[PDB]
């Protein structure tokens, strides 16, 4: 049980050594042979530590008249891609080490899903419950002012985001402050932060993005023949059942899209108890119950559950809350064949070993929950584009589609009978709903699905390349380091 | 008969009071109940008055050697979206009050068609006939210089446009001046103004945009069951006939697209006489006659018309010239069920009452002629994109289309006979023309149709929401104020 | 009794016609003779109207939670010198016409005292008594934000100042806001406004500048032989007595320096009564009494005064409060030979005629109270310099002075006696105080006196040049128009 920061350092070191050997001769072989390991080892040493860390102490005037000084930190792991990207946490637990490690994570996470941002992460040493709304807006705007003056926020420099303790109203305050002051002359000012409300330039599809991304990550591996063999299961979703631990954003939406394609949710838990019903919980009904009442305790279609839900007999276990839930203790007793990490770091390197030994596939958080990041990239692009996606194409495409169907129609009527008999226009009912409901989120989900697929296949090809097995986590970090290395290598570095 | 400026202030106040009640409890209900009306009433008071007004006095050297000082104004109603957007007028009638009111209009117009610009409007106190071409370019460039220095023109700040007295040659001069001087270092410099000639970054489809947009606005309400019932007519365009007042840009193109979809133009007027032919004037033939000669007087397919054309028995009356043509006098005698305001403010609040009482639908200028603005937004985007629309996709789509038709073909031949019998390739003739003629304007028209539809439905839903009837004008302003309010409300405002 | 705005327009027209004739042939004669009056008349037409006027409407959140929208204006008369310069007024009487006229005045006032700023002036439509301190700081900072975004405040663009309704705490707020936001990257940011407190970059000597400037202007004309003849008086200050109307900043300090050089103050008034004592009021004693109590009513060394103080028999009358105090009524009964306009426009063009007929010299406000402006220029220079005046030189000059005195000493001892006998070191007592008290204000006062003298002689030479007599007011405007004209003329104008 180490801290979710030394874990990340270890993951990098593990993958950096695996890649150093190969980077000598399997993706390289050149002229100056003797010690190009000098160059490979050097580039990896630049990549590991965060390039910049900013520590702040700044004042707000509280509602009662008193002054308070506030600590905050924002670290920028890498600028091999700019802007940097990464959330802002409001919690008294924030430490320079926490934000340095998470910003490191963000670099590799962004590299996996081909999102062109270096990692970054911030935190403000504050308990949001101890402050009024007016004070939280004062803290937020002042924070942005300090970040802007020092080069830690800007559309082309560093683009923050939410992080549980913050949501879209802070992001809105940030965008507003930057646009009114430091970025007043910047046509892309409102691209300085993602997670904004729709009315402030946010992106449709943001709320369901991480959960939907979790579904797409599972789907890519559950449809792969070799991987599902080596676990003793059939492809597709119809055969499988799954359990969800946590019913926040990521857990709820993961349950919904897994359901909508033929899996069987048999248990959901949360900070209190859990529930069980082996006939299959319905996501809409459970979402209504969690919305109406405080928690899921006492669903009128499932009894409470005994012991630990992480061990129920099912095919897919989705840890969607709280780090380090699968540790050395429960690991030998987990019944699931697939562990789909919805949450960040819900598995200790202890459990990794046990799971790897027991041929249980862990689809790693690094990749599986990058859907939110992938869609934050899309929001940033929407703001640079100054237009919602599909605004200029939906109606053009509808006309194109009806021309296509009319061309099939008039062609068949010409081949056979008369002039109206064959009606191979009519879109199906599903095509008709999609045509009518055409909105920005359809484009966003398309891009999300495309990225999760191209990255899942990239990671598989890395796992085969480095002869990793079901250690998908190590293949993900190796895949990231390969990408970050390639940008450094093909650029020089300094002026040398 | 008030001035087209107090009218706009009234329209705002009317819709502001309707929305204030509702914004308390029907789109809001929160924690601090007692006087959140304090916050709603306060936001509306910020929205109403123009934020900034710049008055200029600047010199040109006339062609004879003499110097002349020139007055001009540009007002910026709102920055809740940036850049501001709005035309430039060259007329000795321009007053600070005129531009403050029209810029107010532009905010609400842009909000109706979901165009992300605050309103703005300028005027130069000059009669263009009294000046040579060389002097008009001297006035235009110097005007841009002054606007630029003061934050009243720039790609991300404020984007002017034409307005009858000015056309694309002034817009060109503006773009050139800004790009050569203040905006020299700006990669988006030529987005500082719209209405430009094609060679200067203008957009294809600009000329017909407002008229085409008028057709689409009519179409949306004429296909709506409930609205056409409550007027005693059938949906579609085949049944109907219409009269056009004014044969400038808006009137001509309105007549064309209304004709091309099965309506019957029976009378067109202008500043002199009018004409009549109940068999149906052809737009191409009348456009040729107006182009060849000075006016429409004496069309060799229609006699002159007696009295007032605003009263002919027809279904749709399109005031496409000169404000306040439908007033308290002729209002009780208008035979048209639908009044489609192509021009700006062609209807006094007097006539609004009479029309509302007589169950005559007035499709308001605020919405119906926003097509030009909608396409100016597209020009600005084209300039930021640095590429004409569809330049990268047309040929990719053609190949996709022929693959689709070939897939239908080879599938059917597999099911039935041989290998060439069924030819359900062949696009139809119409699909073929469209494929061959694929150009930027096709995209622009698509986006224009999409916007006029989404906005027509948004306004209907507002009309039902606030239980307005055929008072489409009040629903349009209420719809705009709702949108502008939402951007303020979800942002804070100041640093408080 | 016209308004202090049409008055200024008249003064310009009067001087513009006087100069137009002369500018043809007495300061010009060139090649293209026929109509270089075309060029002279054209340049004067550019100069007269203010180039730019900005009208604002912007929000503050009041202390109670309510929102309020605030009107304000800032006009920039000329940019023939940049930055523009001029005060900010907080009063519900502010009108666009008020600021356009005063900004015009500032151009010509600045030109008289060779201060290289174009004129500007602002006003916010607000009664400062109706707002708390916290609300006045909210209004002030938001005002600066709006000015900055539109090019109406910046160290090299436009530099505001106080104006009775505002003082150094607003100027401080302005400097702070500009420096924290729009001017963050500007090394000269705190030069964006003058009148600042010492701790914020203000200049020593600011408080007494206008009064001291009034003394210097009087002195220059009272020491001139010809002018004091034509009034029937002797040069110097010892002979004369004077009366002061108003005991604000300008009146108090005027009384002090006139006393310190040998004049006899015999009456001071204010908004209530006045006082009289023909033996000579002492300024320190009266300043102590006005500071201790509310007003001057009941000075324990002078009885109240009957009727109007503007008519007491004395040599110099100093209107130092409230416009239009000398009008057509009292004008024929004024006993003073010299009218020293401490206030702005305390004299109607009616009284100008009567005074000109009665050989009574009016030293015009345009020149006589420019001391504050002259010293605001010095503050701006201090802020650009980033060092207080004399900081690097005082001690170098003391050492140089003692070397001079020692050089006289050792030279005389060598000529005559021994080695210590002659002590022509010892500075005098006055030189000693000056050396010990050496501070920034001593430089500021020097520069002020230098400017008031060079400008007084410039105006005298104009008065003789245009054969004006004691109409010093017309000579001052002619002198200013001559200077502004020369900058335009010797630069081209546009790109032509």
Q: What is the DSSP string of B382-444?
A: HHHHTS-TTTTTHHHHHHHHHHHHHHHHHHHHHHSS-SSS-------HHHHHHHHT--HHHHH
DSSP conformation letters of B251-284: HHHHHHHHHTTT-EEEEEE-SS-EEE-TT---HH
Query: How far does chain C reach from its first CA to its final CA, in angstroms?
Result: 43
| Given the residues B121, B138, B264, B483, the one annotated as active site | B121
d(CA B212, CA B253): 6
Structure tokens at C219: 């002195």
d(CA B115, CA B85): 10
Collapsing DSSP to helix, strand or coil, B118 comes out as strand
| Helix axis angle, B96-112 to B371-385, nearest 10° | 80
**Best mutation site among C64, C184, C185, C189 for testing chain A: the one with the most A CBs within 10 Å?**
C184
By CB neighbour count within 10 A (0-12 exposed, 13-18 middle, 19+ buried), where does C185 fall?
Answer: exposed
d(CA B61, CA C41): 12
- Is B121 among the catalytic positions? yes
Residues C37-63 as b or e (16 or more Cβ within 10 Å = b): ebbbbbbbbbbbbbbbbbbbbbbbbbe
Asked if B465 contacts B479 with a C-beta cutoff of 8 angstroms, the reply is no
Which chain C residue has its CA at the smallest distance from A134's CA? Answer: C65
Tell me the Ramachandran region of residue B492: left when phi exceeds 0, alpha when psi lies from -120 to 50, beta otherwise. left
Structure tokens at C52: 């730019």
Spell out which residues of chain C touch residue A184, defining contact as CB-CB under 8 Å. Answer: 149, 181-182
- Locate the domains of chain C by residue range: 1-51, 52-200, 201-495
- Close Cβ partners of C165 (under 8 Å, ≥ 6 residues apart): C89, C90, C91, C128
Length of chain A: 496
Backbone angles phi, psi at A142, to 5 degrees: -55, -40
CA angle at C413 for the pair C407 and C416, rounded to the nearest 5°: 140
Considering just the CA atoms, what is the radius of gyration of chain C in Å? 25
Would strands C158-161 and A241-245 be described as parallel, antiparallel, or unpaired?
A: unpaired
Q: Which CATH code is given to the segment(s) C201-495?
A: 3.40.50.720
Length of chain B: 496
Question: Per DSSP, which regions of C295-417 are E strands?
Answer: 303-304, 316-319, 338-340, 361-363
The candidate with the shortest Cα–Cα distance to A215, out of A257, A250, A245, is: A257
The candidate with the shortest Cα–Cα distance to C301, out of C282, C314, C287, is: C282
Asked if B230 contacts B237 with a C-beta cutoff of 8 angstroms, the reply is no
Would strands A118-124 and A274-276 be described as parallel, antiparallel, or unpaired?
A: unpaired
- Close Cβ partners of C256 (under 8 Å, ≥ 6 residues apart): C208, C211, C283, C284, C287
By CB neighbour count within 10 A (0-12 exposed, 13-18 middle, 19+ buried), where does B122 fall?
Answer: buried
Query: How far does chain A reach from its first CA to its final CA, in angstroms?
Result: 43
Give the closest of C145, C149, C184 to A182, CB-based: C184
CA angle at A229 for the pair A224 and A234, rounded to the nearest 5°: 70
- Close Cβ partners of B103 (under 8 Å, ≥ 6 residues apart): B50, B75, B76, B77, B84, B86, B119, B120, B121
Task: Look up residue B483 and give its DSSP letter.
Answer: H
Which residue in the block uniquely carries the two structure tokens 């220095």? B149
d(CA B210, CA C452): 64
**Best mutation site among A176, A182, A183, A189 for testing chain C: the one with the most C CBs within 10 Å?**
A182
Residues A279-295 as b or e (16 or more Cβ within 10 Å = b): eebbbeebbebbeeeee
Q: How far is CA A210 from CA A237, A326, C83, in A?
A: 19, 21, 54
Which residue in the block uniquely carries the two structure tokens 């009452």? B353
Q: Which CATH architecture does the domain made up of B1-51 adopt?
A: Orthogonal Bundle (1.10)
Q: Beta-carbon neighbour count of residue A163 at 10 Å?
A: 19
Spell out which residues of chain A touch residue B492, defining contact as CB-CB under 8 Å. Answer: 137, 172-173, 176
Helices and strands (DSSP H and E) totals, chain A: 16, 12
- Close Cβ partners of C38 (under 8 Å, ≥ 6 residues apart): B65, B66, B67
Asked if B366 contacts B456 with a C-beta cutoff of 8 angstroms, the reply is no
d(CA A410, CA A414): 6
- Close Cβ partners of B369 (under 8 Å, ≥ 6 residues apart): B210, B213, B214, B250, B341, B342, B343, B344
Q: Distance between alpha carbon B474 and the CA centroid of its chain, in Å?
A: 18
Q: How far is CA C465 from CA B219, C227, C278, C363, C462, in A?
A: 77, 15, 40, 18, 5
Can you name the residues that pair with B264 across neighbouring β-strands? B241
By CB neighbour count within 10 A (0-12 exposed, 13-18 middle, 19+ buried), where does B48 fall?
Answer: middle
Is it true that domain A52-200 has CATH number 3.40.640.10?
no
**Sheet architecture: strand order including A303-304:** A303-304, A274-276, A264-269, A241-245, A316-319, A338-340, A361-363
Asked if B92 contacts B127 with a C-beta cutoff of 8 angstroms, the reply is yes
d(CA A287, CA A82): 39
Asked if B244 contacts B255 with a C-beta cutoff of 8 angstroms, the reply is yes
d(CA A340, CA A336): 10
| Given the residues C6, C48, C100, C121, the one annotated as active site | C121
d(CA A300, CA A283): 13
Asked if C50 contacts C76 with a C-beta cutoff of 8 angstroms, the reply is yes
According to DSSP H, which parts of B72-191 are helical? 96-112, 133-149, 168-180
HEC-encoded secondary structure of A134-179: HHHHHHHHHHHHHHHHCCCCECCCEEEECCCCCCHHHHHHHHHHHH
Structure tokens at A161: 């985001």
Q: How far is CA A22 from CA A467, A484, B52, B407, in A?
A: 12, 15, 63, 44
Spell out which residues of chain C touch residue B45, defining contact as CB-CB under 8 Å. Answer: 67-69
Asked if B267 contacts B314 with a C-beta cutoff of 8 angstroms, the reply is yes
Asked if A246 contacts A365 with a C-beta cutoff of 8 angstroms, the reply is no
Structure tokens at A190: 């409102």
Task: Look up residue B340 and give its DSSP letter.
Answer: E
Q: How far is CA B356 from CA A261, B6, B319, B327, B337, in A?
A: 52, 20, 17, 13, 11
Q: Beta-carbon neighbour count of residue B273 at 10 Å?
A: 14
A201-495 has the same fold as A52-200? yes
d(CA C483, CA C475): 12
Collapsing DSSP to helix, strand or coil, B26 comes out as coil
**Sheet architecture: strand order including C338-340:** C303-304, C274-276, C264-269, C241-245, C316-319, C338-340, C361-363
**Sheet architecture: strand order including C67-76:** B158-161, B84-90, B118-124, B67-76, B52-61, C52-61, C67-76, C118-124, C84-90, C158-161
d(CA B375, CA C392): 64
Smallest CA–CA distance, residue B33 to chain C, in Å, is 14
Would strands B316-319 and A52-61 be described as parallel, antiparallel, or unpaired?
A: unpaired
Give the closest of A173, A386, A391 to B447, CB-based: A391
Residues of chain C that touch chain B, judged by Cβ-Cβ distance less than 8 Å: 35, 38-39, 41-43, 45-46, 48-61, 65-69, 96, 138, 142, 146, 149-152, 493-494, 496
d(CA A162, CA A148): 17
Give the method of determination.
X-ray
CA angle at B447 for the pair B445 and B448, rounded to the nearest 5°: 60
Which residue in the block uniquely carries the two structure tokens 């000169």? B322
Which chain C residue has its CA at the smallest distance from A149's CA? Answer: C184
Considering just the CA atoms, what is the radius of gyration of chain B in Å? 25
d(CA A197, CA A200): 5
Structure tokens at C428: 């005098």
CA dihedral B214, B218, B219, B221 (to 10 degrees): 140
Question: Is residue A486 annotated as involved in ligand binding?
Answer: no
Collapsing DSSP to helix, strand or coil, A363 comes out as strand
Q: Beta-carbon neighbour count of residue C393 at 10 Å?
A: 12
The candidate with the shortest Cα–Cα distance to B4, out of B95, B116, B131, is: B95
Would strands C316-319 and C303-304 be described as parallel, antiparallel, or unpaired?
A: unpaired
């Amino acid at each position: 049980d180490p801290n979710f920061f030394k874990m990340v350092e270890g993951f990098f070191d593990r993958g950096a050594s695996i890649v150093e050997d190969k980077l000598v001769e399997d993706l390289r072989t050149r002229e100056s042979e003797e010690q190009k390991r000098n160059r490979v080892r050097g580039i990896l040493r630049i990549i590991k530590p965060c390039n910049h860390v900013l520590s702040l102490s700044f004042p707000i005037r509280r509602d009662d008249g008193s002054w308070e000084v506030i600590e905050g930190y924002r670290a920028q792991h890498s600028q091999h891609r700019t802007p940097c990207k990464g959330g802002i946490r409001y919690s008294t637990d924030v430490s320079v080490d926490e934000v340095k490690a998470l910003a490191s994570l963000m670099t590799y996470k962004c590299a996996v899903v081909d999102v062109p941002f270096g990692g970054a992460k911030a935190g403000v040493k504050i308990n949001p419950k101890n402050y009024t709304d007016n004070e939280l807006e004062k803290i937020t705007r002042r924070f942005t002012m300090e970040l802007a003056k020092k080069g830690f926020i800007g559309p082309g420099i560093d683009v923050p985001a939410p992080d549980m303790s913050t949501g879209e109203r802070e992001m809105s305050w940030i965008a507003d402050t930057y646009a009114s002051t430091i970025g007043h002359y910047d046509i892309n000012a409102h691209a300085c932060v993602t997670g904004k409300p729709i009315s402030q330039g946010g992106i449709h599809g943001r709320i369901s993005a991480t959960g939907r991304g979790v579904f797409h990550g599972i789907e890519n591996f559950i449809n792969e023949a070799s991987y599902m063999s080596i676990l003793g299961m059939t492809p597709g979703f119809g055969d499988k059942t799954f359990v969800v631990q946590g019913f926040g954003n990521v857990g709820l939406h993961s349950m919904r899209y897994l359901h909508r394609f033929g899996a069987k949710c048999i248990a959901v838990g949360e900070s209190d108890g859990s529930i069980w019903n082996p006939d299959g919980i319905d996501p809409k009904e459970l979402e209504d119950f969690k919305l109406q009442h405080g928690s899921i305790l006492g669903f009128p279609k499932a009894k409470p559950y005994e012991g630990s839900i992480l061990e129920a007999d099912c095919d897919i276990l989705i840890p969607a809350a709280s780090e380090k839930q699968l540790t050395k203790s429960n690991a030998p007793r987990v019944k699931a064949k697939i562990i789909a990490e919805g949450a960040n770091g819900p598995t200790t390197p202890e459990a990794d070993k046990i799971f790897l030994e027991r041929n249980i596939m862990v689809i790693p958080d690094l990749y599986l929950n990058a859907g939110g990041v992938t869609v934050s990239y899309f929001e940033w692009l929407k703001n640079l584009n100054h237009v919602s996606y599909g605004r200029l194409t939906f109606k053009y495409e509808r006309d194109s589609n009806y021309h296509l169907l009319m061309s099939v129609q008039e062609s068949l009527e010409r081949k056979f009978g008369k002039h109206g008999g064959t009606i191979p226009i009519v879109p199906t009912a599903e095509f008709q709903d999609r045509i009518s409901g055409a909105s920005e989120k359809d484009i966003v989900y398309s891009g999300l699905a495309y990225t999760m697929e191209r990255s899942a296949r990239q990671i598989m090809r890395t796992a085969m390349k480095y002869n990793l097995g079901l250690d998908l986590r190590t293949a993900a970090y190796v895949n990231a380091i390969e990408k970050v290395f390639k940008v450094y290598n093909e650029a020089g570095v300094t002026f040398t």
